Design a protein around this nucleic acid. Sequence first.
RNA 1: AAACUUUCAACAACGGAUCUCUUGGUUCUGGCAUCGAUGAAGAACGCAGCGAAAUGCGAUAAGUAAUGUGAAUUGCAGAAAAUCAUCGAAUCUUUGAACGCACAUUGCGCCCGCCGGUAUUCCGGCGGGCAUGCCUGUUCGAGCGUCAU
RNA 2: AUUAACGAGAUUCCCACUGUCCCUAUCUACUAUCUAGCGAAACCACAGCCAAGGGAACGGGCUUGGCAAAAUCAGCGGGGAA
RNA 3: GCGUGAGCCCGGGUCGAACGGCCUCUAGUGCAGAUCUUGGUGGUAGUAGCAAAUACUUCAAUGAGAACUUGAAGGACCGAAGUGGGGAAAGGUUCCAUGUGAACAGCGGUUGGACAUGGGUUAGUCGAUCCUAAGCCAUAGGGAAGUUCCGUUUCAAAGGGGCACUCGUGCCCCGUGUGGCGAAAGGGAAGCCGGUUAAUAUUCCGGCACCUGGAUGUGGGUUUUGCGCGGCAACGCAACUGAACGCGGAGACGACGGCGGGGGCCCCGGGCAGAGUUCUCUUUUCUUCUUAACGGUCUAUCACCCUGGAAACAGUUUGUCUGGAGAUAGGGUUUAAUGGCCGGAAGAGCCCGACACUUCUGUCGGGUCCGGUGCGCUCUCGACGUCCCUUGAAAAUCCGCGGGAGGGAAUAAUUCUCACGCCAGGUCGUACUCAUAACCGCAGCAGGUCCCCAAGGUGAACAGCCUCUGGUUGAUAGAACAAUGUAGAUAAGGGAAGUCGGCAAAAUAGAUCCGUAACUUCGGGAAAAGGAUUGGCUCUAAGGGUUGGACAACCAACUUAGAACUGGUACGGACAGGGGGAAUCUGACUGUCUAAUUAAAACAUAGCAUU
RNA 4: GUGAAGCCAGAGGAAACUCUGGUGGAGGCUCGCAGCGGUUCUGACGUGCAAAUCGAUCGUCAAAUCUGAGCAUGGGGGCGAA
RNA 5: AGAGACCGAUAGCGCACAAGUAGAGUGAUCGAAAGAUGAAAAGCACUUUGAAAAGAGGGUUAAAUAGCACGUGAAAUUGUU
Lengths: 50, 252, 52, 86, 112
Amino acid sequence: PSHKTFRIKQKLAKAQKQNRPIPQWIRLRTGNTIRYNAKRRHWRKTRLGL
Amino acid sequence: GRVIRNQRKGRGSVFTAHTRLRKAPAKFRPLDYAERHGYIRGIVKEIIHDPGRGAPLARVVFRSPYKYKQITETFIANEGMYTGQFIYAGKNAALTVGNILPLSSVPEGTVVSNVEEKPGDRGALGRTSGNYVTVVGHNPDEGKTRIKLPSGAKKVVPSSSRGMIGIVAGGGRTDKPLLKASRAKHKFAVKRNRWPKTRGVAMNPVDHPHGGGNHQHIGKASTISRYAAQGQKAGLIAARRTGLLRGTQKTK
Amino acid sequence: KAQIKQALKKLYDIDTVKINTLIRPDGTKKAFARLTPDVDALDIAATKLGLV
Amino acid sequence: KGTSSFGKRHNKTHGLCRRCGRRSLHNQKKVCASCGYPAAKTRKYNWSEKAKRRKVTGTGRMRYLSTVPRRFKNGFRTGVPKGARG
Amino acid sequence: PTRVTYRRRNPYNTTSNRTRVIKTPGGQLRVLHIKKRGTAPKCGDCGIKLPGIPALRPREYATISKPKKTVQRAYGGSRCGNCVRDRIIRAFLIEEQKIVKKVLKEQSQAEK
RNA sequence: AAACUUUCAACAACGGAUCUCUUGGUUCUGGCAUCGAUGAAGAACGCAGCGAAAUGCGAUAAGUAAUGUGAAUUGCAGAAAAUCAUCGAAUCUUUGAACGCACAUUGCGCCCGCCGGUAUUCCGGCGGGCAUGCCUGUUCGAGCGUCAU
RNA sequence: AUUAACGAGAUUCCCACUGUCCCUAUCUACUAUCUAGCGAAACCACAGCCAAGGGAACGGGCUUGGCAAAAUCAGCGGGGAA
RNA sequence: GCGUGAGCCCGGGUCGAACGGCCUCUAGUGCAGAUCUUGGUGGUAGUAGCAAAUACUUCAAUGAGAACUUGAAGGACCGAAGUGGGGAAAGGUUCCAUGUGAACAGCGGUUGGACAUGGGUUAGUCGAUCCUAAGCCAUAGGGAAGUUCCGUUUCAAAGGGGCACUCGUGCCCCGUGUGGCGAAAGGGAAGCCGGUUAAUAUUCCGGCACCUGGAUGUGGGUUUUGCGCGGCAACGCAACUGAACGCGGAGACGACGGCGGGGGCCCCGGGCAGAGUUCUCUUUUCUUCUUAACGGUCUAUCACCCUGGAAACAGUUUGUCUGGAGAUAGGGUUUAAUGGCCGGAAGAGCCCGACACUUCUGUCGGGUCCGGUGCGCUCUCGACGUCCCUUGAAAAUCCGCGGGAGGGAAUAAUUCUCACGCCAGGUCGUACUCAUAACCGCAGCAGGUCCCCAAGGUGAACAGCCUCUGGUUGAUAGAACAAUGUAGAUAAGGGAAGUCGGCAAAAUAGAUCCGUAACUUCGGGAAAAGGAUUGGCUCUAAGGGUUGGACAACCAACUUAGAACUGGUACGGACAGGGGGAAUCUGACUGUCUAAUUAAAACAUAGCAUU
RNA sequence: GUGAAGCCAGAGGAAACUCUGGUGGAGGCUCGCAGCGGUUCUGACGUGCAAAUCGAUCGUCAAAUCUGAGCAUGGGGGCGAA
RNA sequence: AGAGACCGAUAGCGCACAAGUAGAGUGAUCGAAAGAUGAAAAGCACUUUGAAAAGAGGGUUAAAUAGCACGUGAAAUUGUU
Ligand SMILES: [Mg+2]
Ligand SMILES: [Mg+2]
Ligand SMILES: [Mg+2]
Ligand SMILES: [Mg+2]
Ligand SMILES: [Mg+2]
Ligand SMILES: [Mg+2]
Ligand SMILES: [Mg+2]
Ligand SMILES: [Mg+2]
Ligand SMILES: [Mg+2]
Ligand SMILES: [Mg+2]
Ligand SMILES: [Mg+2]
Ligand SMILES: [Mg+2]
Ligand SMILES: [Mg+2]
Ligand SMILES: [Mg+2]
Ligand SMILES: [Mg+2]
Ligand SMILES: [Mg+2]
Ligand SMILES: [Mg+2]
Ligand SMILES: [Mg+2]
Ligand SMILES: [Mg+2]
Ligand SMILES: [Mg+2]
Ligand SMILES: [Mg+2]
Ligand SMILES: [Mg+2]
Ligand SMILES: [Mg+2]
Ligand SMILES: [Mg+2]
Ligand SMILES: [Mg+2]
Ligand SMILES: [Mg+2]
Ligand SMILES: [Mg+2]
Ligand SMILES: [Mg+2]
Ligand SMILES: [Mg+2]
Ligand SMILES: [Mg+2]
Ligand SMILES: [Mg+2]
Ligand SMILES: [Mg+2]
Ligand SMILES: [Mg+2]
Ligand SMILES: [Mg+2]
Ligand SMILES: [Mg+2]
Ligand SMILES: [Mg+2]
Ligand SMILES: [Mg+2]
Ligand SMILES: [Mg+2]
Ligand SMILES: [Mg+2]
Ligand SMILES: [Mg+2]
Ligand SMILES: [Mg+2]
Ligand SMILES: [Mg+2]
Ligand SMILES: [Mg+2]
Ligand SMILES: [Mg+2]
Ligand SMILES: [Mg+2]
Ligand SMILES: [Mg+2]
Ligand SMILES: [Mg+2]
Ligand SMILES: [Mg+2]
Ligand SMILES: [Mg+2]
Ligand SMILES: [Mg+2]
Ligand SMILES: [Mg+2]
Ligand SMILES: [Mg+2]
Ligand SMILES: [Mg+2]
Ligand SMILES: [Mg+2]
Ligand SMILES: [Mg+2]
Ligand SMILES: [Mg+2]
Ligand SMILES: [Mg+2]
Ligand SMILES: [Mg+2]
Ligand SMILES: [Mg+2]
Ligand SMILES: [Mg+2]
Ligand SMILES: [Mg+2]
Ligand SMILES: [Mg+2]
Ligand SMILES: [Mg+2]
Ligand SMILES: [Mg+2]
Ligand SMILES: [Mg+2]
Ligand SMILES: [Mg+2]
Ligand SMILES: [Mg+2]
Ligand SMILES: [Mg+2]
Ligand SMILES: [Mg+2]
Ligand SMILES: [Mg+2]
Ligand SMILES: [Mg+2]
Ligand SMILES: [Mg+2]
Ligand SMILES: [Mg+2]
Ligand SMILES: [Mg+2]
Ligand SMILES: [Mg+2]
Ligand SMILES: [Mg+2]
Ligand SMILES: [Mg+2]
Ligand SMILES: [Mg+2]
Ligand SMILES: [Mg+2]
Ligand SMILES: [Mg+2]
Ligand SMILES: [Mg+2]
Ligand SMILES: [Mg+2]
Ligand SMILES: [Mg+2]
Ligand SMILES: [Mg+2]
Ligand SMILES: [Mg+2]
Ligand SMILES: [Mg+2]
Ligand SMILES: [Mg+2]
Ligand SMILES: [Mg+2]
Ligand SMILES: [Mg+2]
Ligand SMILES: [Mg+2]
Ligand SMILES: [Mg+2]
Ligand SMILES: [Mg+2]
Ligand SMILES: [Mg+2]
Ligand SMILES: [Mg+2]
Ligand SMILES: [Mg+2]
Ligand SMILES: [Mg+2]
Ligand SMILES: [Mg+2]
Ligand SMILES: [Mg+2]
Ligand SMILES: [Mg+2]
Ligand SMILES: [Mg+2]
Ligand SMILES: [Mg+2]
Ligand SMILES: [Mg+2]
Ligand SMILES: [Mg+2]
Ligand SMILES: [Mg+2]
Ligand SMILES: [Mg+2]
Ligand SMILES: [Mg+2]
Ligand SMILES: [Mg+2]
Ligand SMILES: [Mg+2]
Ligand SMILES: [Mg+2]
Ligand SMILES: [Mg+2]
Ligand SMILES: [Mg+2]
Ligand SMILES: [Mg+2]
Ligand SMILES: [Mg+2]
Ligand SMILES: [Mg+2]
Ligand SMILES: [Mg+2]
Ligand SMILES: [Mg+2]
Ligand SMILES: [Mg+2]
Ligand SMILES: [Mg+2]
Ligand SMILES: [Mg+2]
Ligand SMILES: [Mg+2]
Ligand SMILES: [Mg+2]
Ligand SMILES: [Mg+2]
Ligand SMILES: [Mg+2]
Ligand SMILES: [Mg+2]
Ligand SMILES: [Mg+2]
Ligand SMILES: [Mg+2]
């Protein structure tokens, strides 16, 4: 809702900041195995528990 | 089987009495020096309706003998009491309606209300609408007083016990039929969660001793012993007799 | 707001008439500090803030 | 019941706990279903070995406890290497 | 006949969300949120409204002057004047009766 | 006779079996005894030139000091060691047994001191404090509980 | 036992009414249908024409007969003891 | 090729790093089944199907590609209990701009709540924060082996006010109390208008205000042995001292009914400006014509005061009621603006009209009015009234008073609630959706989910039906029209012969006027049963207010009744809208339950009786 | 829609209380929209839009009416117009 | 810290991997799948067709039928001949 607590707002901020694809230069490092962001979350797919 | 409704009622929870609209308990003044030795004068400010109580209450203001403040009490209103009336409480108070006197200073044959079982308890007996306690007799050497209760019982209380001269207001409240489930509901909605009441024979055996069966029947004697276990006391507890009362009863 | 005003005064010799604040969805605080009418925000930004 | 009743689900039995961080703090009882907050002792039961090991020591950072073995190995000594700037 | 909306986050008609309708100089119909009506102070004896005192919310009386909050006589506020006159007459009569009763008791019970 | 179905074979698909591998498990054995109010375990939020996670760290934030080694780090950029080992000096946000009272609020207080606004009283900034049970001691007290003048 | 009023309660009859029926016919929309695109599931020992016989006493297969011609589409509810 | 066989060996291909024979030792050692476990893959099969919510069409642009992108035009729907405009919970970035391969949007897709890169939420006045409610958790104590249980003021030594020094620490009074959490709908200090962005605005900008707290000024007032003056009074005036202690008020309260006032909306008339129509007619149809908070001023029912003394009782409401406890009447005081005028404020907004121009700049003219109406709708206020064996929160906070403690320079301050003036007002939330796609139902699901505003016509009517503003035109499409269907109907004559059974359907239906049985708890039954009328047009009558001088004139809506004429013998012309009667069983009635097979005669109920 | 008390006026009679016009606006009254519910079609659907929905028809609709948030009762326990 | 007549990616701990992770549930709790190009990215320059994805040539390598759907590459099932 528009009414939010500071804690809830902060956690939403953290989720928004984590919602991104991985950097491209990561895949160029030696020994890299990360192909894509496996913890990607979408507001329509997976509900975050507050 | 289950825990039956009568057993559940003692837990509290949803069966606790409603108290929001009740402003103060109906009690006499604390028994003090003025009431013990002489009298004290109070002024009736209002006659109020107390939800859940058939009888009206009287708000009476007194002066503090020891401080500049003034003290408002809540008495059970005796019928005939009115706003702006002076009432007097004490040993030497006059014998008029609404005055609070010890039973020692009251002649035999007068009716009182909110009679104390023991002096200083601020009233226990005959506090319901249309009810009163009769002063049957005195025993000054023993310092006691025989009284007759609304139920017809005879009791002996110390003569120092106090009572309000007259009869509790509220008249014959039970003289008119409730006539409607809604009116019964409104009556009990400010008292308790006890209405409506389902019959035990309409239940299942898991729910009540009267249980089920292919016909609605108790199936065993409904009179239950005085020393039956909790959960068994459903029906007529310790009934001396049953059936229609067809004459006068020796007990009283 | 008091800390922001004092910090601006100490760090840039900037005097403000009022400061509004919000917290952005990214979690950081954004402050709109209105300067006094006698000081020009364009010159302040050009000379001290590197903004053009 | 079922689909029609699932539409009335817009309240919250549990919120976020300050001690364990899970959404297991009963909003009315004010007690955490996971860590037992606000009780002093952390809620833990021997009939759930999985639950015990999900939060046993070593599942977090160990900000202080990880440095104890080295200090013990060197004897909880104090001071500086004989011949150190400062 | 344009339709209006609440201007605050409270969407319910809860005896504190009182609104009235206004027309703005911009030419459009709008809602104005208004407080509860003031209430006239009552007499402490008879309970009728007291003449000469404005009906305001309780906090509003702290910002108006004393002469507007009271009337210039004994028990100016909180009593209605008729009650004050009754008090004066009653007090005088009780003191007179007390004086004559004490003099009568002294003259007729302590004459020996 | 084609088509279709089926059978057989070659090649091509689908799928991930088999073989080989293994910075991982599992079991046994040996050595050791070291958490926390000097704030633990755990949780939250942040910190990189370019990072979401994992790892590391705490506004001194992919780390500081110190010691040892002795020329890197590396995906790109950059610069004049190191994402090195060791580790005795420090820092260590909000929390949490969690401690001014609370907390579903980044809520509401009190005390001491300093610096400003005309200021012992109000406001603002900064720093240090204010939980409970119990022990020893200190000081101030209560009680015709009691002792002498 | 009776009972005015009330009843999405059970029952019988009467008037009105009508496709419930004699006895069916016709019209409209949306399907079904054909096309483009997209595109499952249930189920599946192997499979799938019958008659009689015997048989675990009701066979698709066994015995003896009838027979028996590619590949198919829309319906259908006898059988598959579906 | 060998072996009866389990198997063993070899040839060819692929492939890339280990492996085998013999004798002993060892075991997690041999699979077709276990509705076996995990994983993968078939026939079915290009099959079932993608059919609720009325619906699309033309041209153009874009693009490789257009039914489901966009522009314009047309045709439609939602039809103010909306498919409209905003909120609460819940979500969390879905909001805005730019770009876009794949995946997703059960068809497509140039489009998207998708993907990618960047932005976006501004408060002393709106909320939280403060208060208390139901309730929860401490404390003192008491239980419990203990985790802990009760306890919330209770078997407790439980606090807050003032004066005095160079300096904090010297005293003097009061005391019965002595915690916290708990409402974004309860209580509550204070902000309005205009403009502005891609996205925020009662928050930004401009103008104009308010509240709280703290400080000390200028003026004013009062006094100098003291703390204002006036009015018969109700009370008034710009202030016009006032500790403790106490009293009172406000906060602060139900449901319903008719009536009256006010705002807004609707409607009517005239005028102004623009637009539509104009074969013909229409002094025509439509739209605009606005005025905030905050203040000043004058009023506004109830009540209260003064004079006076009422029966031949009077005044008076739709209803009531009121009066020797003082009515009618006359004159006053006062609570109560969402009323009039004025400031704000025309400088704004809006509407027209005319001159500049790549842009930078728009600029300049004018106008922005007057009346009426009402069982109208909505909100609000007021005075009455009804109902209750129902009487319909608390606290924080603010104010008044009773009392009279202290203090108050005839030439100087003045314990001032008056005017003006000075300083400050922290923290968190603020985007967007709120739903046939932003929440919950595994999902972009015909379900579910708490509110606010609420136009015109018909009509009794937020009934149905049509329309305006606003919003949509989104639900895979094209063609054909077989059976069987689902949904919507119609049928000659008969009229329940069908069927367990009139299931389903049909018939009735509005309003006005007639008429209405048995039975009855006398209240009902009852809309019983039944019958007649209903359109259009042209008229007539009645039902009100104001002024003159019993009539005339002026003003204003509707409601009812009567008559003639007329056509299709039709008229509640769609929509809307009771079938009825004679009885039996049963439960008195209203009400409640097996969410998802049973709504009943079951439960409940009032009444009765017992303990 | 019906029209309970209370009230006004007029008719009779001798009384007492009869009657007739009005006024009024009571009732767990009634028709009926929204809401709430869920009777029948034993309709649609029945690998659905849906693990209970859809359509028509129905019950109730001013009070034992509907509903939000906060709070309480926790498994042999609760709650139950059963 | 050292070992084994142990297991060898459906085995061995649930986890050889950003595993008590992703995800489910109001919650207590429940809880996966998933290792291997090559010695070295040398991870295919350039031409051409295509709107693009890609294809065809060409290149790297010992090897591309080792091309990030990557060692080998079975069967079920499928296409062509
Ligand atoms: Mg039991
Ligand atoms: Mg009962
Ligand atoms: Mg039963
Ligand atoms: Mg039993
Ligand atoms: Mg028994
Ligand atoms: Mg029975
Ligand atoms: Mg028997
Ligand atoms: Mg803010
Ligand atoms: Mg609910
Ligand atoms: Mg604690
Ligand atoms: Mg962790
Ligand atoms: Mg063969
Ligand atoms: Mg493959
Ligand atoms: Mg292997
Ligand atoms: Mg720490
Ligand atoms: Mg401390
Ligand atoms: Mg401490
Ligand atoms: Mg709070
Ligand atoms: Mg403070
Ligand atoms: Mg200072
Ligand atoms: Mg300070
Ligand atoms: Mg501090
Ligand atoms: Mg000491
Ligand atoms: Mg002593
Ligand atoms: Mg009957
Ligand atoms: Mg078909
Ligand atoms: Mg097709
Ligand atoms: Mg087969
Ligand atoms: Mg056969
Ligand atoms: Mg046979
Ligand atoms: Mg046979
Ligand atoms: Mg067979
Ligand atoms: Mg044969
Ligand atoms: Mg054939
Ligand atoms: Mg069939
Ligand atoms: Mg068949
Ligand atoms: Mg079969
Ligand atoms: Mg190799
Ligand atoms: Mg085995
Ligand atoms: Mg097998
Ligand atoms: Mg076998
Ligand atoms: Mg399987
Ligand atoms: Mg399959
Ligand atoms: Mg098909
Ligand atoms: Mg279908
Ligand atoms: Mg179709
Ligand atoms: Mg459709
Ligand atoms: Mg083109
Ligand atoms: Mg379309
Ligand atoms: Mg329609
Ligand atoms: Mg329409
Ligand atoms: Mg409405
Ligand atoms: Mg909107
Ligand atoms: Mg909306
Ligand atoms: Mg909530
Ligand atoms: Mg968008
Ligand atoms: Mg685009
Ligand atoms: Mg698609
Ligand atoms: Mg496509
Ligand atoms: Mg696309
Ligand atoms: Mg394109
Ligand atoms: Mg996105
Ligand atoms: Mg406010
Ligand atoms: Mg606050
Ligand atoms: Mg408090
Ligand atoms: Mg407790
Ligand atoms: Mg104890
Ligand atoms: Mg609070
Ligand atoms: Mg509120
Ligand atoms: Mg402002
Ligand atoms: Mg401004
Ligand atoms: Mg001030
Ligand atoms: Mg002066
Ligand atoms: Mg209230
Ligand atoms: Mg106006
Ligand atoms: Mg209208
Ligand atoms: Mg007009
Ligand atoms: Mg004005
Ligand atoms: Mg008068
Ligand atoms: Mg003006
Ligand atoms: Mg002008
Ligand atoms: Mg309303
Ligand atoms: Mg009005
Ligand atoms: Mg908004
Ligand atoms: Mg969802
Ligand atoms: Mg829905
Ligand atoms: Mg209308
Ligand atoms: Mg009309
Ligand atoms: Mg209508
Ligand atoms: Mg819309
Ligand atoms: Mg569809
Ligand atoms: Mg049909
Ligand atoms: Mg016929
Ligand atoms: Mg016929
Ligand atoms: Mg007939
Ligand atoms: Mg028949
Ligand atoms: Mg028959
Ligand atoms: Mg029927
Ligand atoms: Mg019909
Ligand atoms: Mg009748
Ligand atoms: Mg009848
Ligand atoms: Mg009739
Ligand atoms: Mg006619
Ligand atoms: Mg008719
Ligand atoms: Mg009907
Ligand atoms: Mg019944
Ligand atoms: Mg119930
Ligand atoms: Mg059922
Ligand atoms: Mg069941
Ligand atoms: Mg049913
Ligand atoms: Mg009713
Ligand atoms: Mg419904
Ligand atoms: Mg059915
Ligand atoms: Mg079907
Ligand atoms: Mg239905
Ligand atoms: Mg039909
Ligand atoms: Mg494994
Ligand atoms: Mg595998
Ligand atoms: Mg596993
Ligand atoms: Mg979850
Ligand atoms: Mg592999
Ligand atoms: Mg090659
Ligand atoms: Mg190969
Ligand atoms: Mg290879
Ligand atoms: Mg391979
Ligand atoms: Mg094969």
